[PDB]
mmCIF file of C-alpha atoms and ligand atoms in Angstrom:
data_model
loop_
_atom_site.group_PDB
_atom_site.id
_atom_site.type_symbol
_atom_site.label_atom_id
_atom_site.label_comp_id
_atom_site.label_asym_id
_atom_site.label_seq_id
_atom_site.Cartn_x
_atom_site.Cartn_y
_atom_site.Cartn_z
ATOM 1 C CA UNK U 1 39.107 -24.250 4.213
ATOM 2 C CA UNK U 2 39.721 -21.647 6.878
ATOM 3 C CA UNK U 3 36.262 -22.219 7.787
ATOM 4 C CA UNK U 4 36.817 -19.825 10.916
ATOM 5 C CA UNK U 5 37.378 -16.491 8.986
ATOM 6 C CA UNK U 6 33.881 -17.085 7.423
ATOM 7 C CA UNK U 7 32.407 -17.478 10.773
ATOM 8 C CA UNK U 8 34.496 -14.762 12.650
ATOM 9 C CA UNK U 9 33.040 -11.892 10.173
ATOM 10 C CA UNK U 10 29.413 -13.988 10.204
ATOM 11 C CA UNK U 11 29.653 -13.585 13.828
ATOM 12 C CA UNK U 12 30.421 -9.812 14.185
ATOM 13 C CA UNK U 13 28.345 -9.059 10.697
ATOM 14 C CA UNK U 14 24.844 -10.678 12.117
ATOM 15 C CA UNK U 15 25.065 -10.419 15.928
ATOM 16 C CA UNK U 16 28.029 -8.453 17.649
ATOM 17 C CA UNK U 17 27.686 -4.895 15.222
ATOM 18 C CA UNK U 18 23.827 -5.183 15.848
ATOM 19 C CA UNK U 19 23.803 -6.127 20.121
ATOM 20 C CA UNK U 20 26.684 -3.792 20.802
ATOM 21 C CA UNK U 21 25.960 -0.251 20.339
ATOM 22 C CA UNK U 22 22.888 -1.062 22.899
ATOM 23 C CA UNK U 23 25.139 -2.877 25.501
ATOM 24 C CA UNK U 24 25.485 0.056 27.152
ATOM 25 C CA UNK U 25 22.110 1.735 27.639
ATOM 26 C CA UNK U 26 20.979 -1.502 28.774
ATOM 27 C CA UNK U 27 23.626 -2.172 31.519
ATOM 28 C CA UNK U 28 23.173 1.745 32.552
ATOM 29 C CA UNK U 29 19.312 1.020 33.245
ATOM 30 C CA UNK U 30 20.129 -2.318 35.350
ATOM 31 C CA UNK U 31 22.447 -0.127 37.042
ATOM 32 C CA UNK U 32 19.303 1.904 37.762
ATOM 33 C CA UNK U 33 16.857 -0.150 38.353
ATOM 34 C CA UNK U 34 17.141 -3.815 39.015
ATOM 35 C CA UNK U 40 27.385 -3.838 43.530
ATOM 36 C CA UNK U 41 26.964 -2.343 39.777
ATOM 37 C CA UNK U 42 27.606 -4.552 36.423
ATOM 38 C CA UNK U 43 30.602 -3.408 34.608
ATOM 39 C CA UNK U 44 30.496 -1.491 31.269
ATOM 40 C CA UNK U 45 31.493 -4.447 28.749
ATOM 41 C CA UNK U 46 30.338 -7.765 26.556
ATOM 42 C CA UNK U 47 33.185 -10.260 28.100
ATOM 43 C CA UNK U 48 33.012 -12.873 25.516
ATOM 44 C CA UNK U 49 34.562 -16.459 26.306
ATOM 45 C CA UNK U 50 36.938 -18.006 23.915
ATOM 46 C CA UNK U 51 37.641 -22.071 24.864
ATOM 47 C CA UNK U 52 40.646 -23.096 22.604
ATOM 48 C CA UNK U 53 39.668 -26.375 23.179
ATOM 49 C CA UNK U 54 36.146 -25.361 21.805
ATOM 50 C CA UNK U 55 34.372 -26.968 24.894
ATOM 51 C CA UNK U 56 31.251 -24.831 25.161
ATOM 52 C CA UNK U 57 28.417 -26.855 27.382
ATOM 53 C CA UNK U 58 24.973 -27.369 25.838
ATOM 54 C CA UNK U 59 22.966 -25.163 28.053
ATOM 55 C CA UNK U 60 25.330 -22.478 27.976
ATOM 56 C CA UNK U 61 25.618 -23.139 31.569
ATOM 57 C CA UNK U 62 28.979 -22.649 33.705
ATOM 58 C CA UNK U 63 30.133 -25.452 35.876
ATOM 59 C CA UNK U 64 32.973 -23.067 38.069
ATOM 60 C CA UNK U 65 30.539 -22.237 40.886
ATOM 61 C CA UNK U 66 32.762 -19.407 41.525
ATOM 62 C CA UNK U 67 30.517 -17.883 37.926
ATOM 63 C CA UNK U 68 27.724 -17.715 39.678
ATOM 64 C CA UNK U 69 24.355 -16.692 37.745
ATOM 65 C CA UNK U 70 22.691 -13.465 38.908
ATOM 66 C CA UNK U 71 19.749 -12.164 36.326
ATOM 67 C CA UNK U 72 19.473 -11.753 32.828
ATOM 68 C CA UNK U 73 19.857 -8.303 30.761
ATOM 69 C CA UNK U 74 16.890 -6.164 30.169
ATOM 70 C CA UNK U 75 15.996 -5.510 26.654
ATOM 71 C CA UNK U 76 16.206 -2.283 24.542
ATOM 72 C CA UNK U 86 14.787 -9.705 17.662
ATOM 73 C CA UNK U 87 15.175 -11.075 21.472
ATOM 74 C CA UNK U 88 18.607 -11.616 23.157
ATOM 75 C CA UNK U 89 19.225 -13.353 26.383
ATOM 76 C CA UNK U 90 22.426 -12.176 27.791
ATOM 77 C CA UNK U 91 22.793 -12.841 31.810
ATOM 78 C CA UNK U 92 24.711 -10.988 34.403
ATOM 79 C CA UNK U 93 27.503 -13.096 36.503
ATOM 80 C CA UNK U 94 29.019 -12.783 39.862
ATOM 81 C CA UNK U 95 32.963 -13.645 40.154
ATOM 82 C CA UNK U 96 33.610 -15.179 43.634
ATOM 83 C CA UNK U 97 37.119 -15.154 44.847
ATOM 84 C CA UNK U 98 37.812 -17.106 48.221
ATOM 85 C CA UNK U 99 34.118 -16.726 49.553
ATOM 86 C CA UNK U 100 33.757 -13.164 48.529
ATOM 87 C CA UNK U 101 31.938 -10.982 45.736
ATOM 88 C CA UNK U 102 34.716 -9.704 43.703
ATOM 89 C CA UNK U 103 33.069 -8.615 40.372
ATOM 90 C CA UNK U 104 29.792 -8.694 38.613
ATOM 91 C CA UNK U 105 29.637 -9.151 34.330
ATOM 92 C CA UNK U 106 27.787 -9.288 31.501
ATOM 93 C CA UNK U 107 29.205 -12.986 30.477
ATOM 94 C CA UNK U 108 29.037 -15.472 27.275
ATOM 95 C CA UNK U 109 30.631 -18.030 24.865
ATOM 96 C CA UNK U 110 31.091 -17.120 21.708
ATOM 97 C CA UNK U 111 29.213 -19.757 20.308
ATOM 98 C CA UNK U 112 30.639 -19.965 17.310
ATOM 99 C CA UNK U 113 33.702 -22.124 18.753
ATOM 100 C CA UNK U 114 30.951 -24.779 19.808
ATOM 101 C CA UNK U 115 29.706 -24.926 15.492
ATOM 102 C CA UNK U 116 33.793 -25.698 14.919
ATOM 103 C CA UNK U 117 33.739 -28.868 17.061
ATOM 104 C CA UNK U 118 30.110 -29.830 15.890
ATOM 105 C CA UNK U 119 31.640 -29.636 12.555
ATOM 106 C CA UNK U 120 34.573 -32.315 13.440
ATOM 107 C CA UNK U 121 32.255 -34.148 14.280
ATOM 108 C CA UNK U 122 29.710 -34.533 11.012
ATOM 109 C CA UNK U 123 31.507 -36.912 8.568
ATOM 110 C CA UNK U 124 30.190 -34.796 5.400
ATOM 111 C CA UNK U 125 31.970 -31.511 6.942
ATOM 112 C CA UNK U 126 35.470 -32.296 5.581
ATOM 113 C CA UNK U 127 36.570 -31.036 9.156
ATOM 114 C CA UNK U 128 39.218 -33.009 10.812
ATOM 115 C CA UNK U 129 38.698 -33.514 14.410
ATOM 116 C CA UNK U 130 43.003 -33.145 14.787
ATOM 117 C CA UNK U 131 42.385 -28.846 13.334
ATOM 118 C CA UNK U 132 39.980 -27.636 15.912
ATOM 119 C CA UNK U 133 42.719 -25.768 18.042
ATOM 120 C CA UNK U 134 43.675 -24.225 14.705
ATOM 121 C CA UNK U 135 40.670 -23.093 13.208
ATOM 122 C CA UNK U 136 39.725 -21.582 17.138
ATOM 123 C CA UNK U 137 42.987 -19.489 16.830
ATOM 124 C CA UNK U 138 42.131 -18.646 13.712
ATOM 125 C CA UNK U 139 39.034 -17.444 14.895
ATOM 126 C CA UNK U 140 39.943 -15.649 17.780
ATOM 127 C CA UNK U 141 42.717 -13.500 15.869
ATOM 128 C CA UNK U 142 40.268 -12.880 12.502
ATOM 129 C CA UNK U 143 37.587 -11.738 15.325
ATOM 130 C CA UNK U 144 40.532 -9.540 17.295
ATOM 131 C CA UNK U 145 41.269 -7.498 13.910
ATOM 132 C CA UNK U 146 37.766 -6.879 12.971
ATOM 133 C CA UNK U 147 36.751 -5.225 16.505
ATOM 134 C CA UNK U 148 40.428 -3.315 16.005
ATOM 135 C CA UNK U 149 38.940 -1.357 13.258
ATOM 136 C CA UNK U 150 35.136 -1.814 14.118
ATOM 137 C CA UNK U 151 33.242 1.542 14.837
ATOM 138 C CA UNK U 152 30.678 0.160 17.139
ATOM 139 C CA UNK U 153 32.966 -1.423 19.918
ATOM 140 C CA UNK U 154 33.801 1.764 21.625
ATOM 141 C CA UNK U 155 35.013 -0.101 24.343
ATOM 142 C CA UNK U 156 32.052 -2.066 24.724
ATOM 143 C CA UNK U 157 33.370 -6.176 24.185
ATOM 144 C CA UNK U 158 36.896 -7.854 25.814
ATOM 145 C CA UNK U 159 37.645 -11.633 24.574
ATOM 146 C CA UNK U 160 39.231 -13.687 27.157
ATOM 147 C CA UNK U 161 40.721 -16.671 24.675
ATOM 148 C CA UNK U 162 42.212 -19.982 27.343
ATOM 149 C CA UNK U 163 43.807 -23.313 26.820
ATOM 150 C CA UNK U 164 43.545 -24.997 30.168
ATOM 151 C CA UNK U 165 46.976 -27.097 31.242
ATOM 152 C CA UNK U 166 48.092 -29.532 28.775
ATOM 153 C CA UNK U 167 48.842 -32.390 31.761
ATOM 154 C CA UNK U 168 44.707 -32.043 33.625
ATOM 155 C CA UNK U 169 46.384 -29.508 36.095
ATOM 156 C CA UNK U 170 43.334 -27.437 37.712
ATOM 157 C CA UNK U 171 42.286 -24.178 35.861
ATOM 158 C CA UNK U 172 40.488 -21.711 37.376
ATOM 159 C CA UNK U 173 37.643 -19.852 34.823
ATOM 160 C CA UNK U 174 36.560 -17.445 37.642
ATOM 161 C CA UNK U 175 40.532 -15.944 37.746
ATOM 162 C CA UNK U 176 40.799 -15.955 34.218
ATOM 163 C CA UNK U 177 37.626 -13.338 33.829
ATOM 164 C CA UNK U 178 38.602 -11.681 37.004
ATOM 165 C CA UNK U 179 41.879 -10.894 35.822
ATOM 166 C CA UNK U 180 40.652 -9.526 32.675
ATOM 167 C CA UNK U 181 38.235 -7.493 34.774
ATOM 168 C CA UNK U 182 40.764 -6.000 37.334
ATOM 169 C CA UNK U 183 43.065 -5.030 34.017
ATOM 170 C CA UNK U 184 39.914 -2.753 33.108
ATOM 171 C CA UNK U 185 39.691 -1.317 36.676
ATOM 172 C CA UNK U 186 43.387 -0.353 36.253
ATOM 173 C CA UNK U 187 42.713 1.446 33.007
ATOM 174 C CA UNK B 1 38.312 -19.291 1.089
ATOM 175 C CA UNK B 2 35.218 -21.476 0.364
ATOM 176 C CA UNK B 3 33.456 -19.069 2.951
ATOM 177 C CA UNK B 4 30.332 -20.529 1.678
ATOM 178 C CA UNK B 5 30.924 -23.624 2.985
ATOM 179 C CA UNK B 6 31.088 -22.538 6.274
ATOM 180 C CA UNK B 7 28.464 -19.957 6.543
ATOM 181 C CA UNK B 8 25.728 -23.302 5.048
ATOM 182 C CA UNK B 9 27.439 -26.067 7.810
ATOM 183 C CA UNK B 10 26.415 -22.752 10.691
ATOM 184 C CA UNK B 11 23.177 -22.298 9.701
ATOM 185 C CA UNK B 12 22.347 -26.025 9.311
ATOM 186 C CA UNK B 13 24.109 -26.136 13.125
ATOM 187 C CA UNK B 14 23.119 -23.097 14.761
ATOM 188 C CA UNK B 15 19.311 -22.595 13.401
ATOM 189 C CA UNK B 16 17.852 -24.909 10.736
ATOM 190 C CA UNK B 17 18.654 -28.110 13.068
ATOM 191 C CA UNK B 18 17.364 -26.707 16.215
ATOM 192 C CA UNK B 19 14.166 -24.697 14.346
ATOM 193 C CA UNK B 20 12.742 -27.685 12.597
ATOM 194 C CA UNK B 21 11.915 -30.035 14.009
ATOM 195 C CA UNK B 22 9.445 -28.290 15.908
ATOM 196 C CA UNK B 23 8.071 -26.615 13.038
ATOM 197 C CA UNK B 24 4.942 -29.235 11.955
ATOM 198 C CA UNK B 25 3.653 -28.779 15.786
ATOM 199 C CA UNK B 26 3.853 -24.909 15.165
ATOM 200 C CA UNK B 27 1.965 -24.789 12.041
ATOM 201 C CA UNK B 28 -0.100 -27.450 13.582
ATOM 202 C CA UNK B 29 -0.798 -25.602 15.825
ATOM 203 C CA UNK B 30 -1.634 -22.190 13.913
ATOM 204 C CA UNK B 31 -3.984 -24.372 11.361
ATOM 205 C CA UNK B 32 -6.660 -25.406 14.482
ATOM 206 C CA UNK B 33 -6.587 -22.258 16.472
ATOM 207 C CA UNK B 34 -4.724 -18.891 14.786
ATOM 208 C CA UNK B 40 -7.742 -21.391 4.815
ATOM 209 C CA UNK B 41 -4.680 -24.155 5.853
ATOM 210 C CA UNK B 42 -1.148 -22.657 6.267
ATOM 211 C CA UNK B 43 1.324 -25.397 4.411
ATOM 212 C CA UNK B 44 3.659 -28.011 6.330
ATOM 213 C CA UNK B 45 7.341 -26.720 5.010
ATOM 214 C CA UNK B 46 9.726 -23.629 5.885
ATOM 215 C CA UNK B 47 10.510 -22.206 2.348
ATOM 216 C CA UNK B 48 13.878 -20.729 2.415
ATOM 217 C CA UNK B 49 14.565 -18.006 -0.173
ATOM 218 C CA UNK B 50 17.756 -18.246 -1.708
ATOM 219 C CA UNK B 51 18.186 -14.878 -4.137
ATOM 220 C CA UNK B 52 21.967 -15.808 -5.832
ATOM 221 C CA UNK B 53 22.359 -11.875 -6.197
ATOM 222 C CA UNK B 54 22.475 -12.173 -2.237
ATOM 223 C CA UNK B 55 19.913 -8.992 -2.401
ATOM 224 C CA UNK B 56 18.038 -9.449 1.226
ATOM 225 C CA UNK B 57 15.733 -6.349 2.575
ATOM 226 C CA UNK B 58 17.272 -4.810 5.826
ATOM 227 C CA UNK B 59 13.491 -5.331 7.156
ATOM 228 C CA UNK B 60 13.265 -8.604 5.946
ATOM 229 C CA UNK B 61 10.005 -7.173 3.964
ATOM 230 C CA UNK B 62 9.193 -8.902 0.418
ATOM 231 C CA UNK B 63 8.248 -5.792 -1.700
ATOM 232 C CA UNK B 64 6.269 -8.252 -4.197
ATOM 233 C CA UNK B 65 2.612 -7.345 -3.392
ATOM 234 C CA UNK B 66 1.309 -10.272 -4.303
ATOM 235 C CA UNK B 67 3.645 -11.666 -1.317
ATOM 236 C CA UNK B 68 1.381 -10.709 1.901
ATOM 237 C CA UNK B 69 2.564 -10.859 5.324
ATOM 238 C CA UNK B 70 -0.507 -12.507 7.153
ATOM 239 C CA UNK B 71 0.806 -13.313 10.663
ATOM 240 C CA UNK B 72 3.500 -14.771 12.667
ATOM 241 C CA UNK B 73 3.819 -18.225 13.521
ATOM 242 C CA UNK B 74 2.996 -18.834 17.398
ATOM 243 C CA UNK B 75 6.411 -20.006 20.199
ATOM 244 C CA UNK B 76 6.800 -24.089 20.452
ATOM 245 C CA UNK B 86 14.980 -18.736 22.420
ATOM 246 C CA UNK B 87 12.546 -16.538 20.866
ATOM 247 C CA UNK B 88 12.049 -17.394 16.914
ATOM 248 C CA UNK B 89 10.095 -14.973 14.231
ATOM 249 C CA UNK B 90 9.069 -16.748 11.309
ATOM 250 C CA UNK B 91 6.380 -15.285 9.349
ATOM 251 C CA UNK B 92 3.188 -16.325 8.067
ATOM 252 C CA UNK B 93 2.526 -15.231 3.677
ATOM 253 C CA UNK B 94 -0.386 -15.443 1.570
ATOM 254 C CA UNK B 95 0.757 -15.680 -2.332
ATOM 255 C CA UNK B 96 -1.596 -13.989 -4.841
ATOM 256 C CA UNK B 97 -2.242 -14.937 -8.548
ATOM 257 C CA UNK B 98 -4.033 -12.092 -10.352
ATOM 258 C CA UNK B 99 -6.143 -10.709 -7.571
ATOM 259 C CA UNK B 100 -6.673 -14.579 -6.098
ATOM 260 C CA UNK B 101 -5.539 -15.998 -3.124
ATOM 261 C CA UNK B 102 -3.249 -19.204 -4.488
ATOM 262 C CA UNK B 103 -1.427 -20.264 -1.375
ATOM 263 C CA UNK B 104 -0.160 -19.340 2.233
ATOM 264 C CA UNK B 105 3.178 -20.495 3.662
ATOM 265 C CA UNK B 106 6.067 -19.765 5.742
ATOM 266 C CA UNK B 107 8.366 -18.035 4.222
ATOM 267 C CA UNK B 108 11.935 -16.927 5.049
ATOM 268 C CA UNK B 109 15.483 -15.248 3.219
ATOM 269 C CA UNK B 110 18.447 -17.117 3.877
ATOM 270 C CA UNK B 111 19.926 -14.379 5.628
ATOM 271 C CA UNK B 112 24.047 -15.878 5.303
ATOM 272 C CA UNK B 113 23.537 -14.527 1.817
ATOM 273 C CA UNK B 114 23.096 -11.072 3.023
ATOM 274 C CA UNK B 115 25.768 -11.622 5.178
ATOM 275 C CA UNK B 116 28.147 -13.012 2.080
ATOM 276 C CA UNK B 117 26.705 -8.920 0.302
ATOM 277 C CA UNK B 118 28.178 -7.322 3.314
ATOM 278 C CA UNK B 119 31.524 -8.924 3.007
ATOM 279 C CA UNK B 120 31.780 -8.340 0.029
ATOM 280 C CA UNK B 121 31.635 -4.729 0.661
ATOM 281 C CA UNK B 122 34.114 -4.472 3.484
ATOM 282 C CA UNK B 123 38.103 -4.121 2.343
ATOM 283 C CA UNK B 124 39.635 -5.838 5.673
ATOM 284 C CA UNK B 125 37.201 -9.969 4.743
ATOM 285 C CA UNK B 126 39.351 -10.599 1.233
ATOM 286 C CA UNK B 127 35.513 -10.902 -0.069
ATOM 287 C CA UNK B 128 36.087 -9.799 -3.899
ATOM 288 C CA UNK B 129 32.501 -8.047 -4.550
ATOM 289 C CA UNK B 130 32.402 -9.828 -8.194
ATOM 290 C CA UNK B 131 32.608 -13.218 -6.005
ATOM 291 C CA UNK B 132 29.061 -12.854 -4.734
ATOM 292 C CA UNK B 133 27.368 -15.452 -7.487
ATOM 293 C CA UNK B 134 29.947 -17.694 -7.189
ATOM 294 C CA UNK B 135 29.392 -17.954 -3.314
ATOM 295 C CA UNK B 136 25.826 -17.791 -3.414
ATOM 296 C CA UNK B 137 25.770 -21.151 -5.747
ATOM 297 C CA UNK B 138 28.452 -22.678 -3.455
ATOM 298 C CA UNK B 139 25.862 -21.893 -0.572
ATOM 299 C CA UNK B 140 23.163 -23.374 -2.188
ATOM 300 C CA UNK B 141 24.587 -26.396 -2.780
ATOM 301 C CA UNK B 142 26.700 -27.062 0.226
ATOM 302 C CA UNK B 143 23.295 -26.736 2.212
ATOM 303 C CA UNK B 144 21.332 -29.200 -0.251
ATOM 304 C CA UNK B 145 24.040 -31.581 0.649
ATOM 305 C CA UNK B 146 23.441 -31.185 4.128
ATOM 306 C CA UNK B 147 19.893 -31.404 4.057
ATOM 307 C CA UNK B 148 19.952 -34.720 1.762
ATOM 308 C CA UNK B 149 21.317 -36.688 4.843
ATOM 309 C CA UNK B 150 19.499 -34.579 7.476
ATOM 310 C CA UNK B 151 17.509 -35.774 10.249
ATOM 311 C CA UNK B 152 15.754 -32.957 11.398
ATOM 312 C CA UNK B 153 14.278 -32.941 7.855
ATOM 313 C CA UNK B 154 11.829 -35.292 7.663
ATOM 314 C CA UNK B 155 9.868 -33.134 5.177
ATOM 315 C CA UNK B 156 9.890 -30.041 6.405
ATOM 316 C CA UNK B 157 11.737 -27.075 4.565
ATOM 317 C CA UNK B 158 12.086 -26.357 0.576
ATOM 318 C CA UNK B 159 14.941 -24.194 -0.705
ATOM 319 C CA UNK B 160 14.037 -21.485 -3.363
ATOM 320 C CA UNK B 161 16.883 -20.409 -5.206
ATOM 321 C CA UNK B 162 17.325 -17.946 -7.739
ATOM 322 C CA UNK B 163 18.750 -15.641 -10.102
ATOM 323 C CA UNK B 164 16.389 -12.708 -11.908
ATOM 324 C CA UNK B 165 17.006 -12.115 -15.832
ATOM 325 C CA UNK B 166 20.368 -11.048 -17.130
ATOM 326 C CA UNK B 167 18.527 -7.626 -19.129
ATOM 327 C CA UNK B 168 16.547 -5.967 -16.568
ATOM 328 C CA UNK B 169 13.343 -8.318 -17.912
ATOM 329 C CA UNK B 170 10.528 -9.122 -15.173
ATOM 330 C CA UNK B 171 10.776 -11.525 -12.485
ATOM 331 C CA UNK B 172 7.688 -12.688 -10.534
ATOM 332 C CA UNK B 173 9.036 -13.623 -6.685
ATOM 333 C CA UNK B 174 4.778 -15.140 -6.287
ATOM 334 C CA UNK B 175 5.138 -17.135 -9.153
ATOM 335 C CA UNK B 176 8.420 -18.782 -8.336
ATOM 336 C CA UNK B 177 6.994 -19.812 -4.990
ATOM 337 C CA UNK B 178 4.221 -20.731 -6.104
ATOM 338 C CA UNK B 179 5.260 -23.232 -8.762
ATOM 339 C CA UNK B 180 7.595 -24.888 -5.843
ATOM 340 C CA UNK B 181 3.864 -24.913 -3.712
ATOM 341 C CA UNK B 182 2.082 -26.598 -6.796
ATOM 342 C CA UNK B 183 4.917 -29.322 -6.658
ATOM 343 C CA UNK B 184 4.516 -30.400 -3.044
ATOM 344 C CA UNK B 185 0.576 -30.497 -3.400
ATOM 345 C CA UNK B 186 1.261 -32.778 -6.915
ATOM 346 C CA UNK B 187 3.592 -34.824 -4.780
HETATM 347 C C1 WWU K 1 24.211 -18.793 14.402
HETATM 348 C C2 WWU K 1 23.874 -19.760 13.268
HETATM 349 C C3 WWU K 1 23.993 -19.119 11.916
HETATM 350 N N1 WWU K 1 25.168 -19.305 11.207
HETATM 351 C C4 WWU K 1 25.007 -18.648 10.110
HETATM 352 C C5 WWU K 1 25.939 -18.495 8.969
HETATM 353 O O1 WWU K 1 23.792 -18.033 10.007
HETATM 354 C C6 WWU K 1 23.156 -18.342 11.187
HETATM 355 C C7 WWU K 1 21.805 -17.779 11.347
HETATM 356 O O2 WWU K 1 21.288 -17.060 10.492
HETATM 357 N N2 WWU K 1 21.194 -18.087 12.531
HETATM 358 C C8 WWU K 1 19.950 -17.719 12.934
HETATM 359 N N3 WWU K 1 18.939 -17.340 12.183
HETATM 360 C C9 WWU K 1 17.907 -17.095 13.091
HETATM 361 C C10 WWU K 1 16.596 -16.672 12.850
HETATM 362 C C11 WWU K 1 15.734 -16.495 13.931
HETATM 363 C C12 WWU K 1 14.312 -16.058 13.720
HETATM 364 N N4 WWU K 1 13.637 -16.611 12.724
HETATM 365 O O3 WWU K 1 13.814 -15.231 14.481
HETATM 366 C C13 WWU K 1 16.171 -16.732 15.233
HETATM 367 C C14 WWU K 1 17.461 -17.159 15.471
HETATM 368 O O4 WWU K 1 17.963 -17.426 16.711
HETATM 369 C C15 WWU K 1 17.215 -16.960 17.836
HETATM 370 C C16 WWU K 1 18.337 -17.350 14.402
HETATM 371 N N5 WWU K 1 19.656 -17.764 14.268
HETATM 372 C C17 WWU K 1 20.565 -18.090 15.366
HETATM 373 C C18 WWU K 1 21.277 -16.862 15.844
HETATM 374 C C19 WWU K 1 21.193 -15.668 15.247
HETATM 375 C C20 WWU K 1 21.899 -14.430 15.699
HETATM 376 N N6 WWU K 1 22.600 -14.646 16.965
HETATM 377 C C21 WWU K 1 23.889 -15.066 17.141
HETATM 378 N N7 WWU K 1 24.686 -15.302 16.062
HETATM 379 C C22 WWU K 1 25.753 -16.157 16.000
HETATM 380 O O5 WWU K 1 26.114 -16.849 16.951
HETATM 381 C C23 WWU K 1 26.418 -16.218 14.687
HETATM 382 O O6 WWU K 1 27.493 -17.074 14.606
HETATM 383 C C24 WWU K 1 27.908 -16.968 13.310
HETATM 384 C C25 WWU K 1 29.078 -17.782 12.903
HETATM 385 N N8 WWU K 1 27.214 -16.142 12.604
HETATM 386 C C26 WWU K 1 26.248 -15.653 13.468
HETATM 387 C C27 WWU K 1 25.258 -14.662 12.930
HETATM 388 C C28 WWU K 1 23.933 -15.313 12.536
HETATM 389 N N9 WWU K 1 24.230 -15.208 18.405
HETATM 390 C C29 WWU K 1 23.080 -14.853 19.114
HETATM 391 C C30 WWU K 1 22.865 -14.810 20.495
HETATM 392 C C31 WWU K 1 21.614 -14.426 20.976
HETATM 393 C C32 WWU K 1 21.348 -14.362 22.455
HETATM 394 N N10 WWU K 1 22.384 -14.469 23.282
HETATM 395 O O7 WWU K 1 20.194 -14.206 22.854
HETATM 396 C C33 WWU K 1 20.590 -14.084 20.094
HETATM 397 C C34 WWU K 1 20.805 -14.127 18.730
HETATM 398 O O8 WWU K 1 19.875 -13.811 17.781
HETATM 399 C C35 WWU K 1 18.688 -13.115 18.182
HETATM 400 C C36 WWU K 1 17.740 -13.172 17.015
HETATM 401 C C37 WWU K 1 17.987 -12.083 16.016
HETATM 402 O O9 WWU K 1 17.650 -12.572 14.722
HETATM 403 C C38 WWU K 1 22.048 -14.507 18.231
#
């Protein structure tokens, strides 16, 4: 019924708790090896549970620069932030992908999902998922969500200076 | 609530749709150039919600063989089934792991998981994902559930034999 706090612990139980505690190892070898990465997972929260089907990001101020290394495969690729023409920060970027299984689930007649409760159930999410990483021991500052409703009235959103100023808030602490 | 419900529309979403319908050219595959490996993923389904952390059977007359070959990076494993010293069948063979997942909520005080709520779950898994698969596409024949529950008194339960009588069906049918 609040099919999202199922799916916010499935989602830290059988993916973030086991990727995280080796986030940083493998940014501190790109850093190496192959402007550094920063430290964290920055995990994108659509409230409109829009995630595209390649995981792909149409602002081409996100601009794709290489995948992860690895330390059970995971694909995780490093993004450049471009502000007015210029490099201004360089991430370890994703959707949660759970979001995307809300709206395929509005979308199934069987799922008993109304299309009208997918804002809901992706607040629902986000705040179940904010609480478990409050008390979870292998986030040691190692994951920021960055949750956005664009403009109600199609006024232009900007994804790049929504991660940006997530990013610049970590520079300042 | 129904967290069940949930976890079985996820897996159906997230994995089972996207993994099988390129399973037959896999085994396909395996059976001309890696006796015959059989056409169906069989998904084990233990309502205790008991799954190895290795994802290792400990039945020895459950044999890991090999791993099917690539058609995202999947693992699915290869078993040969023994029947008092003979070799009775070889499939592919997998735990459901949202029941593990459903264990490990149930052990953490901040989900509202209730530990003596694990059967009840497990059933409401079961059947939520039969549902599913009964007006399935991507299932044109091609995975078997195995579900369930060891004796009540600590009496003997043979993992081989139950997956092998669900083997005998599909080769009478
Ligand atoms: C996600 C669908 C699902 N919903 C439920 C209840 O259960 C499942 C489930 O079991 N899925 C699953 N089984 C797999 C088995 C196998 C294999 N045979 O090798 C392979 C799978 O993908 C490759 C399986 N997949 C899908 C995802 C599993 C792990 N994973 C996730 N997880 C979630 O998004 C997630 O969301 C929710 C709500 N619960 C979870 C935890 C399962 N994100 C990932 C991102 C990456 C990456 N960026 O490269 C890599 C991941 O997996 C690496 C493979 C490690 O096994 C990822």
């Amino acid at each position: 019924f609040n099919v999202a706090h199922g799916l916010a612990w499935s989602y830290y139980i059988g993916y973030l708790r086991l990727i995280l505690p080796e986030l940083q190892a493998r940014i501190r070898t790109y850093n190496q090896h192959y402007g550094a990465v920063s430290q964290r997972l920055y995990i994108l929260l659509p409230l409109d549970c829009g995630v595209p089907d390649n995981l792909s990001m149409a602002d081409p101020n996100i601009r794709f620069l290489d995948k992860l290394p690895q330390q059970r495969v995971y694909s995780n690729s490093i993004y450049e932030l471009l502000e007015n023409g210029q490099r201004a920060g360089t991430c370890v970027l994703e959707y949660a992908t759970p979001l995307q299984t809300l709206f395929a689930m509005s979308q199934y007649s069987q799922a008993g999902f109304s299309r009208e409760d997918r804002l809901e159930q992706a607040k629902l999410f986000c705040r179940t998922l904010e609480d478990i990483l409050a008390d979870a021991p292998e986030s040691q500052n190692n994951c920021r969500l960055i949750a956005y409703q664009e403009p109600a009235d199609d006024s232009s959103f900007s994804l790049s200076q929504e991660v940006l100023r997530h990013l610049r808030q970590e520079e300042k602490e």
